[PDB]
Design a protein around this ligand. Structure first.
Ligand SMILES: *Cc1c(COP(=O)(O)O)cnc(C)c1O
Ligand SMILES: *Cc1c(COP(=O)(O)O)cnc(C)c1O
Ligand SMILES: [Cl-]
Ligand SMILES: [Cl-]
Lengths: 502, 502
């Protein structure tokens, strides 16, 4: 399943996971279960509870924390309350009841877009990790969704439905990008045309100015990028972000930006395009990778309250405004005041079902607890732990290839590129590396590792020339498995060197 | 004492008792004791507490419930709060403080008639078990008293004092009734005249229309009945209740009804005369039999807020109104607005002591807890348990007499009639049963059982012919004792059959 996921979906699945916010969730659940039972009125039954009451919830919660000081999840829950009440200044009783009611999953999400306090908490996390601090928190709204996967499906459908993207429109795509994102515009369902914004291996996988300038073409309605990138696993540098900023400000104030920033926390000092061009950007952030929460399906779509999506909607042709008046008629009297972010919500479940739309309340609670976990960790201990783990696995991989590729300030390294030439160069000089590349390819490299270790790697391209290389995730295997990849690739190189000399 | 009670008082005393509401009471007491100690200010003393404080009582109570989840009485107390707050919509803090203050018995009952929340709770129980659901709860008021025993004493005295019953007035009494109720009107203290409303054995102890029509006599001021009956142990059927209803509506809107419905819960789908004619009826309900609480002395008098007792009081001759103005002068400025139900309270302790009158607060608390116990038991598990117990004891009794009398929909069976003829008929045919009755009587039947088993039974009459029969309570003995009664009565029948044949 780990090997099959990389081939099919270009992921990625970590073998680590955040335990403390998970324990806090299950412990909160036991508290909420007791809260439900406090509202059950009848004798001689079993298995039926009532709704949790907001009245006196703080005092009951405080007792629960005091009696269970020995439980890690409970201590976390205790500090979470302080963080929300004391640092965020939010209503403590309202926070607790939203969490209790939320984890019970006994009420339809209200509002459907996101639960009130969860939105306020999660956006603090999002703003911080995206480097978007210069934007007032109150100007950022979130739509809680079933991972980045759901976000992308919802966004393209709403773009189509609301006439923001039309058949024949050009979508610029920062490349190399993983397979799934190439196909969605290529669907006849959308019939969009791709323009490649190509990263340069000579610039260490940054986008050249010349490539970024392609965005000046007014036929290009949207810039779509994974940042930090996947496969290449680098973050857009200061120059690149500035270039986009100037292009938007100077030439294309109408350019929509769709940015997928799931790997952000794995970079040093990450800054999102959302931070740089908030009015022009829809941010997709997934909790999957950082918290080891792929199965939880936790994501948000973020939008600035003043954005070009709502501006474009006000500039639509009359026939389209009339069609949308009909579409959203049941939702509100004035459809023209219905914002794009809330249209995403309505479009996600056929409009008529808007009031039972949204991410499940226990999922939002869990998302909120992951968010708190990271926010309360001021010295970034969890982040550093994961980074040290990733570096250890890297050292182990390149042990006999030695050693790892040199990493700059823009490095992410969730993924690593094992380049045959660079490896054979490090081992046996420049002359040998030129020859070794002409002998074997990516196929012979990936098939050998697979046969020796049972691990299949991603080809390392490209698009390029088929420079013989493979990509491994530093997130999904254990040390001896990275050591076995290195050993198999070292024997392959050693046998090439014995076929070099003689 | 069990045998002596049936002979003297026509009871009845169960050998079962409701344990859960009793455990809840004692557990509540320990909580209240701690509440009292929280208000004690001084050092180096022992055995002195203060008054329980309403402030923060919910939170303290909730902690008490959480720490003692393993205690049956405490779990019941926890669910009681939910029932009162959530299902009845009453003030939870006020409920708790009434219960805490109540069980401490540290304040005179206020108001004297009944404690406020206890009245609201207990009437829900009363209305449900009496089948009086069609009457709005707010239109039913209760006077908490020391069992049905105190109720009857109080009611007759107030009837006399307030001129509603006068010497020479006729009291109709549904018969057979147990001894105590025959004597109270016969007292020179009241000098009332009895009219027998006779139940018909041919109608399975229902009152014939012809007997019920006796109520048309305007000299009959009150209909007094035990329903379900005692001794006969049947409930008034649909026809009988309708007959009384029409008689009251058509001929006697002035007829007072006094109904004693202690056995109600032992019938299937019981409906009280209070439900049928609320404006005309004073309901006496005792908790003694159903909860096995004879020693607790727990009863209520129930009255509709719009009733013929207050109507009659407004129609009294001027000399009587003047006398009552003097009597109740200290109570309120306008004595003519003092309702009959509150007159019962004032008459119970000599008027001048009205403000220290009423049932003890711990008794009312216990009554409230019995009421909750039954209200919260939606599937009527306790009721069914008692009924199955009663049926088992019946099967055991008639095992060798076999088998029990056929029971119709109006059957109660707390008591059972052991008819010699019917028993000997079931065993040895109709011819033998006619002869066996002419040989032995009720005396020879009751004296034989007494000598063989040590149990004395009630004669089974009548008034009738002395058809040789005995009444046993199915509530007061254990299985082997019922088996010994059956065996003694079977040998008596077998020796009669050996004196038949030869
Ligand atoms: C793993 C990954 C995601 C996260 O997907 P979810 O559906 O949120 O689990 C998003 N984008 C890219 C490019 C990824 O590699
Ligand atoms: C047992 C019984 C009662 C109950 O008497 P308390 O004084 O309430 O215990 C009332 N009426 C009748 C006919 C009974 O047999
Ligand atoms: Cl835990
Ligand atoms: Cl107990």
């Amino acid at each position: 399943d780990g090997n099959r996921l990389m081939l099919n979906a270009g992921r990625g699945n970590p073998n680590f996971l955040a335990t403390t916010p998970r324990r806090a969730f299950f412990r909160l659940g036991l508290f909420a279960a007791a809260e439900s039972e406090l509202s059950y009125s009848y004798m001689n039954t079993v298995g039926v509870g009532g709704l949790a009451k907001i009245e006196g919830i703080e005092g009951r919660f405080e007792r629960y924390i005091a009696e269970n000081r020995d439980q890690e999840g409970v201590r976390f829950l205790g500090k979470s309350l302080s963080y929300v009440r004391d640092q965020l200044g939010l209503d403590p009783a309202a926070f607790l009841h939203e969490m209790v009611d939320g984890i019970l999953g006994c009420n339809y999400p209200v509002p459907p877009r996101m639960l009130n306090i969860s939105e306020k908490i999660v956006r603090q996390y999002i703003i911080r990790e995206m480097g978007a601090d210069a934007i007032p928190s109150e100007s950022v709204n979130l739509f809680a969704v079933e991972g980045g996967t759901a976000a992308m499906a919802y966004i393209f459908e709403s773009m189509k439905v609301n006439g923001l993207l039309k058949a024949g429109d050009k979508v610029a795509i920062g490349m190399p990008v993983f397979t799934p994102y190439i196909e969605i515009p290529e669907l006849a369902q959308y019939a969009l045309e791709e323009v490649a914004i190509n990263a340069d291996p000579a610039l260490n996988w940054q986008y050249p100015d010349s490539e970024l300038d392609k965005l000046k073409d007014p036929a290009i309605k949207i810039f779509f990028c994974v940042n930090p990138s996947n496969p290449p696993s680098v973050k857009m540098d200061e120059r690149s972000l500035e270039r986009v900023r100037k292009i938007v400000a100077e030439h294309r104030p109408d350019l929509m930006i769709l940015t997928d920033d799931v790997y952000g926390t794995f970079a040093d000092g990450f800054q999102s395009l959302f931070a740089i061009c908030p009015a022009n950007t829809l941010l997709v952030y997934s909790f999957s990778k950082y918290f080891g929460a792929t199965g939880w399906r936790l994501g948000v779509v973020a939008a600035h309250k003043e954005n070009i999506f709502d501006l474009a909607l006000g500039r639509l042709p009359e026939s389209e405004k009339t069609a949308l008046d009909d579409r959203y008629r049941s939702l509100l009297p004035d459809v023209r005041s219905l914002k794009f972010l809330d249209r995403l919500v309505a479009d996600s479940r056929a409009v008529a079902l808007n009031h039972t739309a949204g991410l499940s309340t226990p999922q939002q609670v869990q998302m909120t607890l992951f968010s708190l976990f990271a926010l309360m960790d001021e010295s970034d201990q969890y982040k550093h732990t994961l980074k040290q783990l990733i570096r250890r696995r890297e050292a182990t991989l390149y042990r006999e290839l030695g050693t790892p590729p040199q990493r700059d300030e823009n490095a992410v390294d969730y993924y690593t590129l094992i380049d045959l030439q660079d490896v054979t160069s490090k081992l046996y000089g420049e002359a040998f590396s030129k020859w070794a590349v002409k002998q074997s390819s990516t196929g012979d490299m990936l098939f050998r590792i697979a046969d020796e270790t049972g691990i299949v790697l991603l080809p390392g391209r490209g698009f390029g020339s088929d420079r013989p290389s493979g990509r491994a995730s530093l997130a999904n295997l254990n040390e001896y498995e990275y050591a076995a990849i290195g050993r198999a690739l070292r024997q392959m190189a050693d046998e090439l060197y014995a076929q070099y000399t003689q």
